[PDB]
Structure formats: C-alpha cells, structure tokens
Design a protein around this ligand. Sequence first.
Ligand SMILES: [Fe+3]
Ligand SMILES: [Fe+3]
Ligand SMILES: [Fe+3]
Ligand SMILES: [Fe+3]
Ligand SMILES: [Fe+3]
Ligand SMILES: [Fe+3]
Ligand SMILES: [Fe+3]
Ligand SMILES: [Fe+3]
Ligand SMILES: [Fe+3]
Ligand SMILES: [Fe+3]
Ligand SMILES: [Fe+3]
Ligand SMILES: [Fe+3]
Ligand SMILES: [Fe+3]
Ligand SMILES: [Fe+3]
Ligand SMILES: [Fe+3]
Ligand SMILES: [Fe+3]
Ligand SMILES: [Fe+3]
Ligand SMILES: [Fe+3]
Ligand SMILES: [Fe+3]
Ligand SMILES: [Fe+3]
Ligand SMILES: [Fe+3]
Ligand code: NA
Lengths: 154, 154, 154, 154, 154, 154, 154
Amino acid sequence: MQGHPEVIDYLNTLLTGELAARDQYFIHSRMYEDWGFSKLYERLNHEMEEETQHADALLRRILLLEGTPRMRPDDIHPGTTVPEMLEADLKLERHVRAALAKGIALCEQHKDFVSRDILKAQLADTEEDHAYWLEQQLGLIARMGLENYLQSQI
Amino acid sequence: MQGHPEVIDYLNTLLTGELAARDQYFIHSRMYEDWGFSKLYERLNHEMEEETQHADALLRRILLLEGTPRMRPDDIHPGTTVPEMLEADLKLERHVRAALAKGIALCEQHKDFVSRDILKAQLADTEEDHAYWLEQQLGLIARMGLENYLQSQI
Amino acid sequence: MQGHPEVIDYLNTLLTGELAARDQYFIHSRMYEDWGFSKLYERLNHEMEEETQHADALLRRILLLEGTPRMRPDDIHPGTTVPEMLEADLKLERHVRAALAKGIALCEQHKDFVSRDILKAQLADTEEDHAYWLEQQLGLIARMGLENYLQSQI
Amino acid sequence: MQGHPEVIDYLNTLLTGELAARDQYFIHSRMYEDWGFSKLYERLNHEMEEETQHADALLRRILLLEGTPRMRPDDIHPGTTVPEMLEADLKLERHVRAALAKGIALCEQHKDFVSRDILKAQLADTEEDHAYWLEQQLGLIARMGLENYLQSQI
Amino acid sequence: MQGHPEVIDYLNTLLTGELAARDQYFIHSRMYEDWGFSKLYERLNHEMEEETQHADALLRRILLLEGTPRMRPDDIHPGTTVPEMLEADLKLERHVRAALAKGIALCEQHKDFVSRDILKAQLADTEEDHAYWLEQQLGLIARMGLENYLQSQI
Amino acid sequence: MQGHPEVIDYLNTLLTGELAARDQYFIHSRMYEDWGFSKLYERLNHEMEEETQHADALLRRILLLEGTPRMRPDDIHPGTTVPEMLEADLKLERHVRAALAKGIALCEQHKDFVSRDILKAQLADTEEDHAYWLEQQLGLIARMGLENYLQSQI
Amino acid sequence: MQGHPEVIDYLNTLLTGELAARDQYFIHSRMYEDWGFSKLYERLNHEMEEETQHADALLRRILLLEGTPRMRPDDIHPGTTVPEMLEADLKLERHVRAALAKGIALCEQHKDFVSRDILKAQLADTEEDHAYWLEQQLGLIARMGLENYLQSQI
Ligand SMILES: [Fe+3]
Ligand SMILES: [Fe+3]
Ligand SMILES: [Fe+3]
Ligand SMILES: [Fe+3]
Ligand SMILES: [Fe+3]
Ligand SMILES: [Fe+3]
Ligand SMILES: [Fe+3]
Ligand SMILES: [Fe+3]
Ligand SMILES: [Fe+3]
Ligand SMILES: [Fe+3]
Ligand SMILES: [Fe+3]
Ligand SMILES: [Fe+3]
Ligand SMILES: [Fe+3]
Ligand SMILES: [Fe+3]
Ligand SMILES: [Fe+3]
Ligand SMILES: [Fe+3]
Ligand SMILES: [Fe+3]
Ligand SMILES: [Fe+3]
Ligand SMILES: [Fe+3]
Ligand SMILES: [Fe+3]
Ligand SMILES: [Fe+3]
Ligand code: NA
C-alpha cells in the first residue's frame, strides 16, 4: 500500500531524529561508565535500546508504505559533564516531543490513522519515560546538590 | 442494633477525617514520586492504603450500628516541599490522635466497648506507626541535613 | 513540561469527579454488604479500586504537566435501596462518560495527544465495563423481577 | 473423485443452511450476553462453534467430490426476547433435522455411503444435542415460569 | 489468684448463658438439616462451636480465679419455623450482648482487666458476627420474600 | 447508551464486510488444503478466525450502543487458482482498509471515540498483518516464480 | 592513560565505519523482511547486533585512552535487490577488513598491543563470519540460480 508522500517524508524526518537519539545515548551511556557512574550507564544504555526500537518501528512502517528509509542520523550534541549531558538529552527529547506531536497532526489530516498510533506510542514514551526521567534527575541535583546526586549514581 | 446517636455522630466525624488523611497521603505520595523520591512515594502510598482501611473500619461500624455514613472528606492541606509535607502530615496525625483519644473516652461513657476497641487499634497505628515515622524523618533531617536526607530517599 | 492551562484545568475537573466516583462506590459497596448481598459488595468494591486507579492516572498526569492537583471530591449522591443505588451509579457513569468525551475533544484541539489517550482508556472502561454492567443489572430486574434479582446477589 | 451431481447439489443446500445456523447462534449468543445471561451466551457460543464445524465438514466433502461450495448463508430469523430466540433456534434445528434426514436418503439412493455417514453424525448432533437442549429450556420455562428460568441463566 | 467474688459470680451468669446459646444452636442447626436447608445447618453448627469456645473461655477463667463453675445451662427457647428460629436466636444474642456489656463495666469497676478483655472479645463476636448475621437473614427475607430466601439456603 | 444512528449504521456496514471476509477465507483455506498446500491452509484458517473476532467486536459494540446487528454477509468473490485467490483476498483487504479509515473519520466527527479505537485496532490488523502478508506472497511469486512459490507452501 | 593520538584518530575512523556497517545491516535486514525473506532478515539482524558490539568495543577503548569518540556514521550504500544488497554488504566488509588490518599494523608500530588485540578479534569476525557468509550466499546463487536461492530464504 502506497503511503501519502507527505506522511512518508515526515516519518523519514522522525527516523533520522531517532537514529540520532540512539547515538547520543550510545555515547553518553559509555561516558557515564568511563567515569564510574554505573547507574547512569544502565539507564542510558536502556534508553539507547528504546530509541533503537523507536527507529525500527518507523523504518518498518516506511517500508510497509512503500517508501525508502533515510538512514543518515541527525547531528548529535553530547555534553562534557553530567549536568550538561542530562540537559543535552532533555533538549533532544523536547525536540522529539514537538516533532512527534506535529507528526500526529499531519497523520490525522492525511487519514493515516495507523501511522498516527505508532507516533502516539512513541510520544507517550518520550513524555512520560524519557523526558520525565531527565527532568527528575535535574530536579534531584537542584534539591540535594550535584555531589550528593553523583554519589547516588555510582 | 442501633448505636447511641452521640457515638454514631462521633464515628462520622472520625470517618471524614480518615477519608481526608487517605487523600492527603494520595497527593503527597504522588508528589514525592514526581520529584524522584521513590522511598517516600512507597511509604506514603502504603499510609494511604492504611487510612483507607481505617476509614473502611469506621464506615462498616457506622452501618452495623444503623447509622448513615458521612462521606465528605475534611479539607486537606498539602505542603509544597519535602519538609512542609512531612510537617503537614505530622500535624494531621496529631489531630487524628487527639480525636481518637476523645472518641475512646466517649465510647467508654456510652458503654460501646466494641467501637472503643476499633478506635484503640487505630490510635495505636496513629501513634506508633504513622506519627512516629514522621517524627523520625524530621529528626533525621535535623541530624544529617536535608540534602543528605533527600539523597537517602531516592 | 508545562501542559496547556486549559487541559490541566479540565484534567482537574475529571480528577475531582473520579475521586467522587471512588467514594460513591465505597459507600454503596459497604451498604450492599450490610444487607447481605455479597456479590454486589464484590463488584462495587472492585469498581472503587478501578476509580481509584482512574483518579491516580489523572493525578500523575497533572503533576507531570507541572499542574497542581485538585483533591476535593465532587459531591456524591448515594441511593437508599438496591434499585436507587444502581440508578444513582449509572447516572454518575453517564456524567463521567460525557465529561471524558468532552475532554478528549479538548485535548485534540490543544494537541495534547498523550492526555487524550489517557482519557480514551478511561472512556472505554466507563462505557464498556462500568456503565454497561449497571444497565445490565437494571435490565435483569426488569426481566425477572427485583426479588429474584436480589436472590441472585446473595 | 467426482461426486454425483445430485449429492453435491444437496450437500451445498445443507452447507448454506449450516452457515446460517452458525450466524443465528452468533447473534443470539451475543444478545444473551448483552442482557447479562452468561449461561445462555456460553451455550449458544458453543453451538455456533459446532455449526461452524458442521459447515466445515460439508465444505470439505464437497471439495473432495470435486464440487464448488456455495458460501452464501441462508437468511436467518433472530427473536427479540429469550422465549422467541429459543423458539426460533428450535424451528431452525427442526428444519435442519428434516433436511439432513432427506439427504441421508438421497445419499443411500446414489450409493454415496461416506457422505451418508457424514450427514448421520450431524443428524445425531442436531436431534440429541441441539434440538433436545432447546426443547428442555422451553420445558423448564413452562415448569418454573420465565422469571425463575431467566434467574437461573445469569 | 482469687478473683473478686462479684466478678466470679457474674462470669458464672455469663457461662450458663453461653452453654444455653450453644444448645439452642445445637437444636436449631439440626432442625434446619432435618428440613433440607444445609446452608443454615452449616452456619448454626459453626455458631454452636463458637459458643462452646465462648463457654470454655469463661469456664477456664473462673477456675483460674479459684471459683467454681456453674454448669447448668439457662433455659432455651427454640422456634418452630425458619423465621421464628432466626428471631429466637437474635433475641438470645441481644440478651448476651447486654449481659456482656454489663460485665465489662463490672470488671472495670473491680479492676479485673483481663476478665474485661475476655468479655470484650466475646462482645465483638456477638455484635459483629452472630447478631449481625441474624439481622441480615431477616433483612433478606424482607427484601426477596421468605420462599426465595429459603430456596437460597438449600 | 444509545449510539449515534450514523455510527451504528456504519458499524453495521463494516460488520457485514467482516462476516464476508471470514467466509472468503473459509472457502480459500479449505481450497488450499484440497490442493495439498497446508501452509496456505494454516495461514488463511488463522485469518478466518481473526475476521471472526473482528466481526464479533463490531457486533458487540453495536449491541452495547443499542443497535440491531445486520448479519447478512456481503457477497464474496473466491479465485480459482493460487494467484487469483491471493489477489482476490488482497482486493478485499484493501476495500476493508478504506472502509475502516472512513469509519474512523466518521466516529471522530460524531465524538464516538471508543468506536473509533475499535476500528483503529482493526485497521492496524488489516494493513500490517492481513494485507501486508498477501502483498508479500505475490512479491515472492514475482521473485522466484510461481512453481517455486507453490513448492514452498506444501 | 592517554593513548597515542595517531592510534586514537585511527580507532575513531574504524568507529565511524562500524556505526555505518550497523546501519547498513539495519536497513538491509528490514528490507529482506519487507519482501518476506525471513532467513535473510534473521542473519542480517544478527549482523547489525554484532557491528553494534564492534562499535561499542572501539568506543569504550577510545574513552579509556582519554580520547573523544566520533559518532557520525560513514555514508551507507544499500542495494535495491537481493544480489545488489549481498554485494553491497560484501564490498563494505572488504573495506572494513582492509581498514582493520591497517589498524593492527599501526597499533604494533605505536606499541599499543591491547588496541591491536581488540582489532584482531574484529578482523577474525569480519573475515571468517561476516565476509565469508556473504561470499557463500553469492556462491549459492551462482550454483543453483537466484530463484532457488530466494526460495531457500523464505
Ligand atoms: Fe524516541
Ligand atoms: Fe526519546
Ligand atoms: Fe522503559
Ligand atoms: Fe487513621
Ligand atoms: Fe494516620
Ligand atoms: Fe504498616
Ligand atoms: Fe472512572
Ligand atoms: Fe466509572
Ligand atoms: Fe474490571
Ligand atoms: Fe448443524
Ligand atoms: Fe444444529
Ligand atoms: Fe457439544
Ligand atoms: Fe457467645
Ligand atoms: Fe453468640
Ligand atoms: Fe466465625
Ligand atoms: Fe477484518
Ligand atoms: Fe482482514
Ligand atoms: Fe495474527
Ligand atoms: Fe565490524
Ligand atoms: Fe562486519
Ligand atoms: Fe555470530
Ligand atoms: Na427464585
């Protein structure tokens, strides 16, 4: 079944964004482990796997719709300290959140309700899991101080 | 069996207080989780269930005594920071403690010994579990500082 | 992430409605047990737990969206006989149904698709589980008579 | 192996009748559940599966005999109340009974003994299981009254 | 340890009452079974065992207090129909309830707090289990009719 | 709860389409087995069960909405060779796909969000499971030839 | 421990190559599944995971050596048919093979023997697993024909 070209193009834009999110969590998780923060390594390694699944869902939907997937990831922007890396990931998730919400609206307009639902599942993950967790870590640093926070992530 | 109207009215006063305690722990536990303090979420979620059971015991006793339960909870008063929320819950438990002790005396006077015993079980829970735990948390903050305390509740 | 103030306000309206539904099933289930209808106690006790979960989902979503939850339950309106209690619960569920459907429309308009989906799950529960069951009980009374119906709920 | 055209045509007549029986039990079982009679839902759901198997046996035998199956179900005639639905199903089974018995005679005449045996198995099901059960339910209503009968099917 | 003679005498009054309650449930449970109401047999057989335990607790406490137990049961008053037997048992439990409450007051006055607690446990059983169940059965008869009620106790 | 007459009518149109899809897979699966292609029998037998479930979901939703289900299946159009049967099923699924998408739009317009979600689940099944599989089989025939494809389905 | 800048730079060149290999197998495996060749999907999905591990080993070694990893994948070059995709992957693995062998020589020269061993493990995987398997598939096509080969990969 041929998808609507505007939907296919927009899924491709989301795909390159998810491939980038995967890779930014790849580098951040391994940096966290290089510094000895294994709890941060574990969480971001887990988020890398989740973005890989998000990318996979979009890639397969594009193929089903007879489109050609775009595999070049967007540029990533890693931080250099724990607070910068948390902020840089939160900035990325907020961008993903906005892009997914715009996609859902586009899918509704072109009556592609299955692509809409695929994006909705990713939007819930983005808001309620990925972005929320980052906001909580930054909140914790604010409440107990960075040194105590870092101690808790060994 | 028709209870004494003064006892039934007083059980109803306690009931609306317990429904409120349940709801104040409902909001505080979820606020604690919103900030990433899962140990505080777990304890207050547990206390919400215990106040629900306290309310249930009073509600069933009122019905057994052929009274009509009052289901409007008292006003609650949530705090806005961890120390204010702990203090606000301790203030509420101290009020419950006083109200239960007054009820036990009333039940003795009207020779309703089973209602007295129901209140005594709740008074022990209030003093030795709920209020005591809150006093201990405030004590801990005083001894190690708020930042270290908050670190311990992640 | 800050939610849209109109969505947050509307989630708060639904929240106080769910807290009330929870409490109306609290009193009805215990009245049913006071009269010896344990099958009605069991079903409405189960519905009380489900409304507690509905309230919990709304409360957590409001906090995630950086809003302040409103914890005062709406007024409840218990019946005094089995048919009045069934009708009073069906009236409440029909109100919840309308309020949720209005909320879904509002969430679509403000492009809050995750809040929309949370409400949709509750709307399905309301229509296909809660309200439908009540309609069936009233239907049964109509088909076999109230006395036979009550016999079946011991 | 090419079957006798008169046998193949008659198997096709039975097939469209069985597809209809399946569909009449489909709608009746779901109506029974819509009204809260789960024991009637369960029995008629089971009968729908049995008619599906009856249709399947005829369909496969027609193909084996190198015929082309007729897949249009006969018209169905659902009732609007429990007694009308029971009577409407009993009327249908009596028609099936007569049609199968006529088929067995035809199969004997054309010396198609395996098709005869397939019909005999369905005739036993029709008389001793499907029609008999319906006669018993109508008999029960006559002996204890419809209201008591309906109570028993919750 | 010698108990207070007024407490010992009053425990003896309760003892002969409990021995009678045991025997009234002995005859009623067996009458219920003679008529084919096995659910009523089971409940009252269970209540006979509970009154036997109530009597046993009083008997042992009297001996501990160096008193001599009075083993003559009070007169019993069995009914002749299911409603009369339920009413006759409810009348007896209400008498026991009053007698236990008077005993608790006497025990408090003579500072026999362990005998008081023994009576309190029996008072809770009497109000919340024995008398309450009887009130519920009479309530059920009132709501569905005696014939439907009796059907439910086969 | 009374559904909107336009939604109920449209659910009925989908229902008769699903009953037909069920029956077209009924005949195709059994034809595939008659020719010795057991892997094709297994897949289409499975699809027959899935369309039966799709029909069941629509039928129950129509009853819940106080409508009367239409049980006459649409005409079916079986093929006479493996390629014609695959094409005929793909044609049917494409029709179902379009009809479901039109229904979702109608349900949104009449604010029946639960019926919308029921249709969305079926649309995902139709696009991503049923139609996609058929497209893949036709694709395989194109890539390896019909004879090799048929060999693989024994 | 600070690595030699020439070794770190060369590990970074290999890293971007491995991230690309991962992504080329990502798209090819999903294309193979889109066409119904599940055995090819499974093998290339497995190779994607192996290149992810190869990239991970290089990334961690670069961090250990106090370098900054380069996360931009090299351009990929997917084929459009099964033979082109196999050839395109074999071309990539041959490039990786040459690059790893050049790296081992560089590591020996700068006396970084642990980085050398990490590359040697990847070189064995590349030659004896990845490239060899691709050569075998192309060989199979040559020996039995493409149509028979494709049949075998369903
Ligand atoms: Fe994502
Ligand atoms: Fe994300
Ligand atoms: Fe997760
Ligand atoms: Fe309490
Ligand atoms: Fe408390
Ligand atoms: Fe506890
Ligand atoms: Fe609800
Ligand atoms: Fe509800
Ligand atoms: Fe449920
Ligand atoms: Fe049949
Ligand atoms: Fe039949
Ligand atoms: Fe059977
Ligand atoms: Fe007793
Ligand atoms: Fe007793
Ligand atoms: Fe007991
Ligand atoms: Fe379907
Ligand atoms: Fe389908
Ligand atoms: Fe499936
Ligand atoms: Fe590699
Ligand atoms: Fe490789
Ligand atoms: Fe391997
Ligand atoms: Na009856």
